[PDB]
Design a protein around this ligand. Structure first.
Ligand code: ATP
Ligand code: ATP
Ligand code: MG
Ligand code: MG
Ligand code: ZN
Lengths: 100, 271, 48, 305, 305, 271, 100, 48
């Protein structure tokens, strides 16, 4: 290849492999905050449903027909929504499993 | 007679220390420091302040010891004492003795670094940076330890600390990226030899990295070739390496600007 | 039973069909993004 | 008939959060404030003492140096002390990876250099710490060892003028990303102002000695506080002298006569004020033990044997 | 061998113009400053005393109210007193013949309203009066009854920072008629700074009591003054107690023991300082007669009978 | 009992006044004022403050009396007491009793005027302005007396004061110009009747001015015609009078802008 | 005249006189500071020769051949210049005479 | 004897002919203006 001319010949082989490997490696997963601490960027890596639904509506600009206050009242976090809260706990446990 | 007051003050300070009146001893330490400085006895004042700070540290008087250490730094600054390894070790010991979370350390180090060769780059002797980094690593303050190592001139201990930090905190897939980040930052600091030694040691000693310059990880091979090119100084090689490894360099976007400095620093790339 | 059933049945009474569907899919997208980018700090925050 | 000559109401008023101790210089603001904080520490879950006075003495009062960040006071588990720092936030160590923005560098340099020595910096920094506390709520109550009447009044006025200025600005907001920061500050600003203006949330302890200068400085301070509408319903008369009839001396007798005259004047003038009388002690009131002993009589109405 | 324990040097140093009295609160800054001014009035052609402390007490000390403009002190012919005014210059009565310029009206309104209550206004106004004096030279010498150590140090630093800022501005002058006004101010600014930094022109009298807090506050004040390079070569130990061996009492004895300890500490610490010792008096030190009597011993080394 | 403190304080104040301890009496006056105001006894507080200020004036306690007078003004302001002639006379007496050169007067008058109808024009009752002007004239403070007269509603005494001021200070050729200035300023203040009466009285009584509306001085005739036109309100007459008398109006240039107001005020001239 | 039409006829005569007089009256002399005190203007109404000569040169932009410092030295206010100072005193006395 | 003789003879040694004449006439103009506009306050200032 053209670029191979500039680099020394013995660098030429490995690079191709690195290129070939590079085309199949799955993109970088979200980084560890420990690593990010070494960079000045302020990037980083909604448990409660009322605010999650409000954010979804805001990002979609959906107009609640009755009211958003009713939406908040419709639950008040009862046992059938505690179902969802421990569903969240389980989901983040599975996340941790995939990142041990 | 006129001088007799100072000797009596010193004796009273000794007596108060014996009695355990630590705060009064701290105040009299301040007074003695100012009296000595007024007499231009910079060395004696600094030694007295250092002894008092060590004593207050031994007895748990954290705030008093920090104040006396800051007075030591003031003595160093005002007298324009040339940086010496012994004084740097003294300051490093004082910094280690401090409470890690206390803000005084931040005030101390910033001043201490600002003292040692305060005219250029907060450098002083990178020996001081190495000592601070080692102290933090022993304290397991990995972030500040890494920062100082990057500003230091010791790569071997730096590489060992990076290995420990990655194993303890780094994810499975970030192992190569940690050393890549450290190496690129070293180059951004214009310290090529530190980058070479740290990369070599990290690759050799890290359990999850297979020995051999032909590393399986594309990023490690890219870093090795980049170091060799920087040794050569050929801009075309740097551009080729950056282009061919773009998928790996995109793993952390900031790498790119690091390269922008590297090309400017080791390959004459205009800003 | 699961999150989507709960939210769909709750929102079927207060949003329009298009609005409810858009809200639900936006919530699913946000949840997927949060799961993807989850880190340890998120785990401690949740534990608290 | 008269109000009990003790700070018992202060202890019993649990909603009380911000406590200010002030008066003429040298009357005992530091010692009385430390005593009050010690008494509170036996009731509240955690109490802080802040030496807003640039001439910090709480370190001398408690015989234990304190930093600019709250630190547990030796001998106590829930009592903390701090001295306000006139200097602005320290400069973080630059990364140096990239050439620093000279504009921000010099802006922060001037911020940390010029206004650090400006005459009004001390009260402003005290106010900033008050804002930090209203953002934190870490401590149950906080006791301020304020500077003398003048600068303490300046500090107490500062929230009102700053809130008025921010309100004016928001009126002029319509006629460059600082708007969000202003809107973030303004809630904290009305919060601090409202808490200072609420008797249930705060109170000012005026400490004075039985003398003409101290008496009328305290009177002026009380009137200025009333103008600021800061509740103040108790005075601490300090350094009183009680002659011993067994072996009296001219000095103590004359001092007692003067103090009795001015204390009768105080009692006549300050109805509806808990006037707690603190005798002069023959030993330095310094250290946890001595301060606690002094506070014990600060709460129990002292009466000569 | 030791320096004479009197302010005799202050009187004899005729070139002295600006005299600052400061220290810990309540030590007697007001009374000692009034005494020094009275002593000077018997030597200089005319002496002024300025109560820069917002909690003005010179009116109480001399038992005669004083305005914000110098006024002759009752009982003296060449002695004047004043209290600094935090408020800015009053608004002149508008002519109303023509519609007033709203821009200037509101500018002056804000000038007289906002910064009037700003925390740093007091020291700034004191500095402005100092500038006025350096423009007037009406009085031979002026004695400042300063606020406690902190705010007094702020005031003493203010000329340096303001002069530095004006120098910076004049460097930036090249990059709208205010330039002439800046050039008119700058001479006065270097004049005040130079006079403050000249020992022959000014000196700081540190007044303190024989106690730990006062002692070490005075030490910090002295060190800060040395940092500001303001000459200070005499201390006024005040409110000392001298027991009468004929009929001693426990209180006076213990107080004398404490004061003797801290006074020995002072003498050891403050070599090359005229340490003048002022006893506690059994009568209020107020009014011209009492103040003059107190000053008499302020100059003659007191010794118990 | 709770109230007993105030009565004892008042008795002690009486005793101190008897003893001659004037400053302590002043301080206790302040204390009593604040106590009374806290009880909303505005009238009693004001009367007490007025009596104390008068007493301190009688004994030469200038600064104390000024402070008590300012407290009287504060009582008037806070209680929102409607302006009455007696209170205005009281304030005028207090102002007269003050030291003419003391700054407090400036602070007092500005406040007092600002109190009386403080919502519009610093006017209050022009009775107050007249009283202040008369007091200043007796003190021979001609400048401030003239200013207040111009802001006052009394022209006769104003004219007499102008005559005295011109004779004592005015030059030989300025006699007519003084009254012209005063009249034009009155018109600028929208007080036509005051201008008429002052001009009539000044012309009639001034020794150097010959009686008769047909005055020899062109300026006096111009002023008379201007007053008559303002009564008529005809703009054309005003313009004619201004043009024909331009040589006289140029004697003091500022007259012109006064006319610019007059035409705007009495002849509908747009600004 | 035209302007006479607007004003009442009986005003007409006097005005002409005022006009005629107005054309001969010598302009206003400098006003008394007492009068000027009634007006907000800051108008108002060099005893030593060194500064007077300096001002004359500045207003004329004259370049001293030798030096201005020499010009100041050339006098130092001796008796022959005290002649000029009492000449000034006499001149202002004559001024006062013309304005008694 | 009078002001003009003094100033002319003094300035004949240090200014050029044109410069000396201009300075002298400017001084005379300034003196005339000062005399014209002289008032009492000037008289007190001179007396001091
Ligand atoms: N009741 C008391 N008995 C004996 N000594 C006292 C008493 N109260 C205060 N003191 C001592 O008097 C001195 C002045 O008191 P303190 O320093 O507490 O005053 P302050 O009001 O805090 O002063 P500043 O305004 O200067 O901060 C200190 O030495 C203090 O120890
Ligand atoms: N030597 C003395 N003997 C007796 N009383 C004294 C003596 N010195 C001061 N006092 C009294 O002690 C009190 C405090 O003194 P003073 O008011 O002069 O202090 P200060 O330093 O001016 O205070 P501040 O900082 O509050 O202005 C006053 O009542 C004063 O009269
Ligand atoms: Mg204190
Ligand atoms: Mg004082
Ligand atoms: Zn005694």
């Amino acid at each position: 290849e053209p670029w191979a001319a500039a680099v020394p010949p013995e660098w030429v082989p490995i690079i191709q492999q690195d290129i070939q490997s590079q085309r199949k490696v799955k993109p970088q997963p979200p980084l560890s905050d420990a690593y990010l601490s070494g960079m000045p960027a302020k990037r980083r890596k909604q448990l409660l449903l009322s605010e999650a639904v409000s954010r979804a509506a805001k990002a979609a600009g959906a107009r609640p027909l009755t009211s958003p206050e009713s939406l908040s009242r419709d639950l008040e976090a009862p046992e059938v929504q505690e179902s969802y809260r421990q569903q969240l706990r389980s989901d983040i446990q599975k996340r941790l499993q995939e990142d041990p | 007679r006129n001088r007799g007051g100072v000797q009596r003050v010193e004796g009273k300070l000794r007596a108060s220390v014996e009695k355990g009146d630590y705060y009064e001893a701290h105040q009299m330490y301040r007074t003695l420091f100012f009296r000595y400085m007024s007499q231009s006895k910079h060395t004696e004042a600094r030694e007295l302040m250092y002894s008092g700070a060590l004593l207050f540290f031994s007895h748990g008087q954290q705030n008093s010891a920090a104040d006396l250490s800051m007075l030591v730094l003031e003595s160093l600054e005002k007298a324009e004492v040339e940086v010496a390894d012994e004084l740097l070790e003294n300051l490093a010991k004082v910094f280690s003795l401090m409470d890690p979370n206390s803000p005084e350390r931040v005030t101390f180090v910033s001043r201490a670094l600002k003292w040692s060769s305060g005219g250029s780059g907060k450098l002083g002797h990178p020996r001081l940076h190495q000592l601070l980094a080692l102290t933090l690593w022993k304290e397991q303050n990995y972030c500040e330890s890494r920062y100082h190592f990057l500003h230091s001139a010791d790569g071997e201990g730096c590489a060992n600390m990076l290995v420990e930090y990655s194993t303890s905190r780094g994810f499975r897939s970030e192992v190569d990226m940690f050393v890549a980040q450290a190496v690129l930052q070293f180059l951004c600091l214009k310290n090529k030899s530190s980058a070479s030694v740290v990369f070599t040691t990290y690759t050799q000693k890290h359990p999850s990295i297979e020995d051999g310059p032909p590393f399986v990880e594309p990023l490690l091979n890219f870093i090795w070739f980049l170091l060799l090119a920087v040794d050569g100084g050929k801009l075309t090689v740097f551009t080729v390496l950056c282009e061919q490894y773009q998928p790996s360099l995109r793993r952390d976007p900031m790498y790119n600007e690091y390269l922008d400095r590297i090309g400017q620093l080791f390959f004459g790339v205009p800003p | 039973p699961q999150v989507w059933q709960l939210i769909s049945k709750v929102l079927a009474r207060h949003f329009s069909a298009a609005d409810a569907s858009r809200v639900l899919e936006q919530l699913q997208r946000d949840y997927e993004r949060s799961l993807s980018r989850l880190t340890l700090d998120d785990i401690e925050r949740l534990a608290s | 008939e008269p109000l009990e000559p003790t700070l018992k109401n202060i202890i019993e008023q649990k909603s009380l959060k911000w406590i200010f101790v002030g008066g003429k210089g040298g009357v005992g603001k530091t010692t009385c404030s430390c005593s009050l904080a010690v008494q509170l520490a036996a009731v509240r879950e955690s109490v802080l003492i802040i030496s807003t006075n640039p001439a910090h003495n709480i370190s001398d009062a408690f015989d234990q140096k304190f930093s600019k960040v709250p630190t547990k006071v030796k001998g106590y588990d829930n009592l903390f002390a701090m001295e306000i720092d006139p200097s602005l936030g320290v400069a973080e160590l630059p990364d140096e990876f990239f050439e620093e923005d000279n504009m921000l560098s010099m802006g922060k340099k001037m911020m940390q250099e010029a206004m650090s020595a400006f005459p009004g910096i001390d009260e402003a920094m005290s106010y900033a710490e008050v804002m930090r506390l209203v953002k934190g709520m870490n401590f149950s109550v906080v006791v301020f060892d304020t500077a003398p009447t003048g600068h303490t009044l300046r500090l107490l006025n500062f929230p009102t003028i700053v809130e008025r200025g921010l309100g004016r600005l928001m009126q002029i907001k319509n006629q460059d990303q600082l708007a969000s920061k202003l809107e973030e500050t303004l809630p904290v600003i009305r919060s601090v102002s409202e808490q200072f203006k609420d008797p249930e949330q705060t109170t000012f302890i005026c400490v004075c000695i039985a003398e003409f200068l101290s008496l009328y400085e305290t009177e002026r301070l009380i009137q200025e506080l009333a103008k600021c509408r800061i509740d103040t319903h108790n005075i601490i008369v300090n350094q009183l002298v009680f002659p011993d009839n067994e072996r009296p001396c001219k000095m103590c007798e004359a001092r007692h006569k003067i103090q009795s005259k001015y204390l009768d004047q105080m009692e006549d003038l300050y109805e509806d004020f808990h006037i707690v009388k603190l005798p002069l002690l023959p030993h330095e009131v310094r250290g946890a033990d001595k301060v606690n002993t002094f506070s014990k009589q600060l709460l129990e109405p002292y009466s000569p044997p």
